[PDB]
């Protein structure tokens, strides 16, 4: 509904999952789809292919809004950092621009202790 024309794609790439959320330019979320909810539970949702399917399903569920342009805002590391954007072009959207947002502290909070 409401026939939104311009949207924003928020790819929350991580080392363990990938959450794709398509919002309008004002931040309101219109629909979402993750990698682990796509039938890729376990060690298959880390893979960059599982994140591609998330971009496909998130391209759906916004069919009603009829978006025609997308800005991609990638966040974090992880395999689903590249294979998600190209699936948002193979899904028929137009990528107006790509912006990398990522929390990089200027030596702020103390990170967790090293794994052994």
């Amino acid at each position: 509904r409401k026939q939104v024309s311009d949207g924003v794609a928020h790819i929350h790439a991580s080392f363990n999952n990938t959450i794709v959320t398509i919002t309008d330019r004002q931040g309101n979320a219109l629909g979402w789809a993750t990698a682990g909810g796509s039938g890729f539970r376990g060690s298959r949702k880390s893979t960059p292919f599982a994140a591609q399917v998330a971009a496909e399903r998130c391209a759906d569920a916004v069919k009603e809004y009829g978006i025609k342009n997308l800005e991609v805002m990638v966040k974090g590391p992880g395999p689903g950092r590249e294979s998600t954007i190209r699936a948002l072009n193979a899904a028929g959207f137009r990528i107006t621009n790509i912006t990398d947002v990522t929390p990089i502290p200027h030596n702020g909070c103390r990170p967790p202790k090293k794994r052994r």
């Binding site: 974090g76 590391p77 590249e82 954007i85 190209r86 072009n89 990528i95 107006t96 621009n97 790509i98 912006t99 990398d100 990522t102 990089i104 502290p105 103390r110 990170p111 967790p112 202790k113 090293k114 794994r115």
Partner: protein, 70 residues
Amino acid sequence: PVIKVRENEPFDVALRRFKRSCEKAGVLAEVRRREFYEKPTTERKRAKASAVKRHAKKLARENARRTRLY
């Protein structure tokens, strides 16, 4: 690493330019570095150890410049 897609352009050109911007900014290196706490005594030792390699390996190829192998 913001990349704006210009006019009269392909897409795979833009995506390759996005990686180049991100690789030049060292985003993934910084994220991987800040994952766990590196003790100050291991951050200083890891810096001097990697500079010792930088010096010797440059002087190792110099001693190997004035040799014939066969």
